[PDB]
Amino acid sequence: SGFRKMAFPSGKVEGCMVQVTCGTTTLNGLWLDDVVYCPRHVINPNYEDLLIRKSNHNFLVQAGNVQLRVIGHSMQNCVLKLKVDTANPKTPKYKFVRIQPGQTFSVLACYNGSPSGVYQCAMRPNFTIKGSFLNGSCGSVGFNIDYDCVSFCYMHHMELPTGVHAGTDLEGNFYGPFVDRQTAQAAGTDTTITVNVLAWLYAAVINGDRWFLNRFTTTLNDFNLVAMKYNYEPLTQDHVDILGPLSAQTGIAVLDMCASLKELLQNGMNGRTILGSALLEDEFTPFDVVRQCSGVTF
Amino acid sequence: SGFRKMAFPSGKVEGCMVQVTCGTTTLNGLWLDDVVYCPRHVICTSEDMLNPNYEDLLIRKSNHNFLVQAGNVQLRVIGHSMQNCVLKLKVDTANPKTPKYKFVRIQPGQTFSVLACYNGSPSGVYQCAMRPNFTIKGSFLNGSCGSVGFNIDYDCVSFCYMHHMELPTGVHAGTDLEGNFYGPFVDRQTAQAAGTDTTITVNVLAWLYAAVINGDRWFLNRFTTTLNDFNLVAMKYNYEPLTQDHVDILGPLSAQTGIAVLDMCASLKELLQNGMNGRTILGSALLEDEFTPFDVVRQCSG
Ligand SMILES: O=C(N[C@@H](C(=O)Nc1cncc2ccccc12)c1cccc(Cl)c1)[C@@H]1CC[C@H](C(=O)N2CCCC2)O1
Ligand SMILES: [Cl-]
C-alpha cells in the first residue's frame, strides 16, 4: 500500500555527470562514451561566432577529481558536444528520446558536476517543467529507465520569470517556443493533463479510496465539453485505450471514471482528500500507476 | 526557484542492494563491507509468524541455508548473527561498491529517501518522513522488506531505516540499521495498530518559510503569539507541540526572511482557522509537513 511521487533509481545517470567550465561560467555536462553534452550557453548571442573563437583547451571538463582532455567540439541545435579523449567506463545502455507533453521523467539536479537530488516531474502541456533548480543547475538531465536502458529526454537550460523551467531534448531541440537567450520570454497558459488525473484516480481506487465514485457514466464528447471549461487537456480515444488495463483491474470504465472527474470539477472535494491530496494530481501517467502498483524493478 | 519533494541520488545505495533467500522467503539485504543486513523475519515459517522465537529459529540454521544474490552472483555466507530485529550475514566478499557510510537512528519529523526494492533490484526512489507515531507513509508491496531509508549529506550515506512490515492502515513500520524498531512495534503478525498520527508543526513552519523565500506572502498577518497560546491552538488541530528547540532551529530561516518564528506561528494559526480559500502555497492545497528546516535550507540555498 501507499502511493508516492517516485523517481527512477538515479545511479546509472550519476556515473555520467561532469562539470563543464568555460570562462567564468560553470555548469553540468553529460558524459556518454567519448562525448560530453552540455547547454551551448556555457560559451543577442551568435553561437557560431562565439564557438569559432573557442579552442579545445578553453573547455575545462571535470569528472570527479579528474580533468578530462577536450579533443574536439561541435554544436547540434542548442547543445554543445565536447569530444573527450576518454570514453566513460560507466556509460550505461542509453537512447536519446524526445517526449510529449504529459509524459513524466526523473530529474537528477546537479551543481558543479555533483548530483544533489532526484525528483519526478511531468512535461507540462505548455512545454515547461515545474522543477526545483538554482543557479548552476544548467545541464542537469531528465530521464526514464526501460529495463536496463536509460532514455535521456531532457537537459535543463533556463528558468522563466514565473519560476518554471525550460530546456531541450539531448539533440538540442527546445521543448516549447523558447530560445536560449536573455530576452522577454513567458510560459503560455498551462492546462491539466486529463489522462494523468484519471490514472491517479485509478491509483486511489487501487489503494482503497472510493468516495468519489458514482453510478454515472458519460460520453467522450460530453466529458471534453466539461474538461475544456476547466482548462483540462482534451481526452482522446488513445487515452481511453491506454487506461484500459486500469479500467479492467478496478472494474470502473474510463467514461465511468470521467463522470467522477466531472463531478469533482463541478463540486470540488468538499473537505475530503484523494491519496493525501486536496488537488487533482496530474503528474502520474497511466504507466507510472501500473509500474508503482505492481513493483517493476531496474 | 521551485520547491519539489526531493530525494537524494540513490546510486550509492543501489550498489549495496542484494537478494536474501531463506527457504521459500525472499527479501532485500544491504551489503556493506563483508556483511549483509536484512530483517530477521526472513527466517520465519508460514505457520510461525504470530509468536516466533527467533533465537530458536536461528540456532537451527546453518550458513548454507541463506542464499544471498548480488546481481547475477551468488555470495557465500560464512557466518550469521542477530542484533535485535536485524540479521547480519557475514559473507566471503567485501562489497567493492561500499560507499562511505554511518548508521544513524532518527527522531520523528526527520525526513529521508527510500530506495524501494524487490528481489534485490531497485524499483524506485521517494522522499519520506518518520511520522510522530513512528510509522512511515511509504509505498511498498510484498517483497519490499529490507528496502532502506537514508540521507546523503556530503559524500557519506547515513542509513536510518530498514523496512520490515505494513500495518493494517496501509502505513509502514521498520527499524534502524541496528535492528531497533521505531515505535511500539514488534516483528510478529499479532494485532498491532499505529497510534493517532499528528502533523509535524516545525516542518509546516519550515515549509511556510520556504514559500516566503520563493515569493508567496498571502498567508502572513500582522499578529504574533506566545509559544503557549500557539500550542493551545495547534493541539486542537492534531498538530505536534512546538518546543523551544523547534523555535531555535527555525532561527536561521527567520533571520533570512525577516519574519520572527512566533509571527510565522501566528500565520499558521490563521491558516488552521480559515483554510486556504481556493489558494495554494508552493503548489499545494494542504499544509505540507514532510520538509524539515534543514531540507528547506538545503533546497533553497544549497
Ligand atoms: O505480510 C507479509 N509479510 C510482512 C509484510 O508486512 N510485508 C509487506 C511490507 N510492506 C508492504 C506490504 C504490502 C502488502 C503485503 C505485504 C507487505 C510481515 C507481516 C507481519 C510481520 C512481519 Cl515482521 C512482516 C507476507 C505474509 C507473510 C510473508 C512473509 O513475510 N513470510 C516470512 C516467512 C513466511 C512468509 O509475507
Ligand atoms: Cl533525527
Swiss-Prot record, chain B:
Q: List the catalytic residues.
A: H41, C145
Q: How is its activity regulated?
A: Inhibited by pyridone-containing alpha-ketoamides compounds 13a and 13b. In turn, alpha-ketoamide 13b (tert-butyl (1-((S)-1-(((S)-4-(benzylamino)-3,4-dioxo-1-((S)-2-oxopyrrolidin-3-yl)butan-2-yl)amino)-3-cyclopropyl-1-oxopropan-2-yl)-2-oxo-1,2-dihydropyridin-3-yl)carbamate) inhibits SARS-CoV-2 replication in human lung cells. Inhibited ex vivo by michael acceptor inhibitor N3. Inhibited ex vivo by compound 11a and 11b.
What is the catalytic activity of this protein?
TSAVLQ-|-SGFRK-NH2 and SGVTFQ-|-GKFKK the two peptides corresponding to the two self-cleavage sites of the SARS 3C-like proteinase are the two most reactive peptide substrates. The enzyme exhibits a strong preference for substrates containing Gln at P1 position and Leu at P2 position
The annotated consequence of N142A reads: Does not affect ability to cleave and inactivate human TRMT1
Which residue ranges does the entry give as Cytoplasmic-facing topology?
A: 1-302
Q: Which compartments does it reside in?
A: Host cytoplasm; Host Golgi apparatus; Host nucleus
Boundaries of each Peptidase C30 domain copy? 1-302
Source species, domain of life:
Viruses
What is the recorded phenotype of mutating C145A? Complete loss of 3C-like proteinase nsp5 cleavage
Give the position of the cross-link Glycyl lysine isopeptide (Lys-Gly) (interchain with G-Cter in ubiquitin): K5, K90
According to the UniProt record, what happens if one changes M49A? Does not affect ability to cleave and inactivate human TRMT1
According to the record, mutating P132H results in: In strain: Omicron/BA.1, Omicron/BA.2, Omicron/BA.2.12.1, Omicron/BA.2.75, Omicron/BA.4, Omicron/BA.5, Omicron/BQ.1.1, Omicron/XBB.1.5, Omicron/EG.5.1
- Check the UniProt entry and state the signal peptide residues, or none: none
Q: What does this protein do?
A: Cleaves the C-terminus of replicase polyprotein at 11 sites. Recognizes substrates containing the core sequence [ILMVF]-Q-|-[SGACN]. Cleaves and inactivates human TRMT1, preventing tRNA guanine(26)-dimethylation of tRNAs. May cleave human NLRP1 in lung epithelial cells, thereby activating the NLRP1 inflammasome pathway. May cleave human GSDMD, triggering alternative GSDME-mediated epithelial cell death upon activation of the NLRP1 inflammasome, which may enhance the release interleukins 1B, 6, 16 and 18. Also able to bind an ADP-ribose-1''-phosphate (ADRP).
Tell me how this protein assembles.
3CL-PRO exists as monomer and homodimer. Only the homodimer shows catalytic activity. Interacts with host FBXO22; this interaction promotes the proteasomal degradation of nsp5.
What is the protein name for this chain? 3C-like proteinase nsp5
Organism of derivation: Severe acute respiratory syndrome coronavirus 2 (2019-nCoV)
Q: Which residues of the full protein are shown?
A: 3264 to 3565 of 7096
